[PDB]
Amino acid sequence: EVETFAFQAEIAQLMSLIINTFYSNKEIFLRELISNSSDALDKIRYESLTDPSKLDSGKELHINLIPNKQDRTLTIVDTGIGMTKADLINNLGTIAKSGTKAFMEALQAGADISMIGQFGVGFYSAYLVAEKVTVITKHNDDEQYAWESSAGGSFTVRTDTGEPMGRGTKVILHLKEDQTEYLEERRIKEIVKKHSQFIGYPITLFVE
Amino acid sequence: EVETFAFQAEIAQLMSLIINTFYSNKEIFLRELISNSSDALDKIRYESLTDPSKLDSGKELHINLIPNKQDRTLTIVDTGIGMTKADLINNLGTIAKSGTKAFMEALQAGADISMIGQFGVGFYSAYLVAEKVTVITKHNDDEQYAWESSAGGSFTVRTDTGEPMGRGTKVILHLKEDQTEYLEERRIKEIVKKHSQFIGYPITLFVE
Ligand SMILES: CCc1cc(-c2[nH]nc(C)c2-c2ccc3c(c2)OCCO3)c(O)cc1O
Ligand SMILES: CCc1cc(-c2[nH]nc(C)c2-c2ccc3c(c2)OCCO3)c(O)cc1O
């Protein structure tokens, strides 16, 4: 079973600006995703302080960067708090309607696209480099869900068959044809060091 | 009634490093506090999307910067989600034990003190400029509380008498004698523009 939803008008607009604006500094997508992972990891660490049982679905709090040159996907996995079905539908837990409006007004007054994360909508920077994004997520209070979108104004949500992840969020970037540099090991390392060097959780870059 | 608590050893250590390390770029305290306010504002905006009644304690989502040269205090107020008594006691809702350890290890490997916010413990950067910090907070699910500390290994929590704030968090910096520059209007504006220029919520700098 697959449900299909329209993005709110404001998120459709944000997505179109990211996809259609000429902007060469596309590499900032990664620190935005890493920063999202870090926030979700913070959240599970804090909840676990009063209820250790929240970590029964995995004690290790970390981030994995997984390139696959065959599928042309870059995957950012964390073992953070994950998301419920309702959070996913509700702009992946972001304040995207108000965040987008504030971001637009900022762009009018001298901001640029790399400041997107300052408005709580950094997730959508994914579309700087990816033609399609799949988000798989598992919250302690819910089943595993798969969100997906190639933009165009719509996204799907379904229950995720098979591969149970325990707890956390997985962002699979199906990369644009001309953005394959972000599957190269030295490129990913360079970007982590440039933008995400000092982070509260370990980051493992998988090799192929 | 006043309760007195010991900081966990790790937070006592973080606090001592901030107070005793020679580090001239003290002005970053403000963007860390503004960034905390922004996160709390994000949180109430998101909760309000499924339950509008969460905003009955105030619809306006903003940040106020209030200097007072007579009391020598700089106060950062927001109308964010606020904090419960347990959050306050639990390192003001931060992941400060793990955050501190990660921050220390980062400092050993080329980080500096301005990266403190990357470890979820930016609040304590307050002690770069303040001899005593008072935090007043009001969550929808609780009464108004006052947290306070002049470091030295301890903090107090009490119920807050009188001045009800509706909803949010108030950080009153009782500034060190030699740090009065942060009460000057042009100094505060300069710092907001340098470090907190593009933020998802309005910031009002009160005049005297
Ligand atoms: C789809 C975007 C995304 C979300 C998460 C994530 N998992 N669990 C949570 C609560 C989050 C999350 C949600 C919203 C958000 C986040 C993180 O960063 C702060 C403000 O916006 C994540 O871990 C990675 C990620 O790329
Ligand atoms: C005492 C530190 C502080 C806290 C808040 C605040 N109010 N409500 C909440 C949930 C928060 C908060 C708590 C922890 C935290 C915050 C924000 O920034 C992200 C991670 O660490 C705040 O609004 C301002 C502020 O200076």
Domain residue ranges in chain B:
1-208
What count of other Cβ atoms lies within 10 Å of the Cβ of residue B57?
Answer: 17
Residue appearing with tokens 């953070």: A80
**A106 at B interface, C-beta within 8 A:** yes
Structure token digits, residue B58: 């105030």
HEC profile for chain A?
A: CCEEEECCHHHHHHHHHHHHCCCCCCCHHHHHHHHHHHHHHHHHHHHHHHCHHHHCCCCCCCEEEEEECCCCEEEEEECCCCCCHHHHHCHHHCCHHHHHHHHHHHHHCCCCHHHHHHHCCHHHHHHHCEEEEEEEEECCCCCCEEEEECCCCEEEEEECCCCCCCCEEEEEEEECHHHHHHHCHHHHHHHHHHHCCCCCCCEEECCC
Ligand 1 atom nearest residue B42's Cα: 20
Q: Are A44 and A80 in contact (CB under 8 A)?
A: yes
Task: Give the SS3 label for residue B15.
Answer: helix
Cβ within 8 Å of residue B188, ≥6 positions away: B30, B65, B67, B74, B182, B205
Residue A175: phi and psi, rounded to 5, are: -75, 145
Interface contact B106-A198, CB threshold 8 A:
yes
Interface of A with B in 170-189 (CB under 8 A): none
Task: Report CB contact under 8 Å: A103, B200.
Answer: yes
The separation between the first and the last C-alpha atoms of chain A, rounded to the nearest angstrom, is 33
The residues, any chain, with a CB within 8 Å of residue B146's CB and separated by 6 or more, are B134, B135, B136, B156, B157, B158, B159, B160
Ligand 1 in contact with A40 (CB < 6 A)?
yes
**Residue in this structure with the two tokens 């506090």, named with its chain if needed:** B33
Q: Is residue A7 less than 8 Å (CB to CB) from chain B?
A: no
Q: How far is CA B125 from CA A183, B135, B174, in A?
A: 38, 14, 13
CA distance B150 to B139: 24
- Chains A & B: contacts with CB separation below 8 Å: 58
Residue A146: beta bridge partners? A136, A158
Q: Ligand 2 centre from B38 Cα, in Å?
A: 8
Contact A73, A65 (CB under 8 A): no
Burial of A128 (0-12, 13-18, 19+ CB in 10 A): buried
Residue B33's region, left for phi above 0, alpha for psi from -120 to 50, else beta, is: alpha
Q: How far is CA A169 from the centre of its chain?
A: 8
Residue that has been written with the tokens 């408005």 in this structure: A119
Tell me, using a 6 A CB cutoff, whether residue B136 lines ligand 2: no
Phi, psi of A108 (to 5 degrees): -70, -25
Q: A172 and A165 in contact (C-beta within 8 Å)?
A: no
For B180-208, the DSSP string reads GGGGSHHHHHHHHHHHSSS-SS-EEE---
Name the E strands within chain B: 3-6, 63-68, 73-78, 130-138, 145-149, 154-159, 168-175, 203-205
Q: Reduce the DSSP state of residue B104 to 3 states and report it.
A: helix
| Domain B1-208 superfamily per CATH | Histidine kinase-like ATPase, C-terminal domain (3.30.565.10)
Report the C-alpha gap between A182 and A171 in whole angstroms: 14
Token pair of B179 as six digits: 């740090």
Taking CA A127 as the corner, what is the angle to CA A27 and CA A112, rounded to the nearest 5 degrees?
60
Question: Beta strand A145-149 with A168-175: parallel, antiparallel or unpaired?
Answer: unpaired
Q: Residue B151's closest CA among B170, B168, B182, B176?
A: B176
Nearest to B198 among A45, A93, A111 (CB): A111
How far is residue A199's CA from residue A115's CA, in Å, rounded to a whole number? 19
CA distance B113 to B125: 8
Q: Which of A134, A128, A114, A108 is nearest to A176 (CA)?
A: A128
Distances from the Cα of A72 to the Cα of A38, A162, A180, angstroms? 25, 22, 7
Resolution of this entry, Å: 1.9
Distance CA A34, CA B135 (A): 30
**Is residue A169 within 6 Å of ligand 1 at its C-beta?**
yes
With an 8 Å Cβ cutoff, are B93 and A50 in contact? no
Collect all residues of chain B within an 8 Å Cβ-Cβ radius of residue A201: 102
- Give the closest residue (by CA) to ligand 2 atom 13: B93
Q: Which residues, 6+ apart, have CB-to-CB distance to B165 below 8 Å?
A: B77, B136, B138, B144
Using the CB atoms, write b or e for B60-74: b if 16+ within 10 Å: ebbbbbbbeeeebbb
Ligand 2 site, residue B130, Cβ cutoff 6 A: no
Nearest to B78 by CA among B165, B173, B7, B190: B165
| Dihedral, A103, A104, A108, A114 alpha carbons, nearest 10 | 50
Instruction: For residue B12, give the 3-state DSSP assignment.
Output: helix
Both tokens assigned to A200: 């509260």
> CB contact, 8 Å: B47 with chain A?
no
What stretch of H or E contains B17? helix B9-20
Burial readout B36-53 (b: 16 or more C-beta within 10 A, e: otherwise): bbbbbbbebbbebeeeee
- Give me the residue label for tokens 């907001």: B192
Report the amino acid identity of residue B124.
Answer: Y
Residue A203 to residue A196: CA distance in whole angstroms: 10
Q: Is B2 on the interface with A (CB under 8 A)?
A: no
Tell me which residue of B204, B165, B184 sits closest to B34, measured CA to CA. Answer: B204
- Give the atom of ligand 1 at the shortest distance from the alpha carbon of A33: 26
Q: Is B42–A102 a contact, with Cβ atoms under 8 angstroms apart? A: no
- Confirm if A93 and A102 have CB atoms less than 8 A apart: no
* Nearest CB partner across the interface for A198, out of B46, B95, B118: B118
What backbone phi and psi angles, to 5 degrees, belong to B203? -125, 125
Q: Is B143 left (phi over 0), alpha (psi -120 to 50) or beta?
A: beta
Q: Tell me if B33 CB under 6 Å of ligand 2.
A: yes
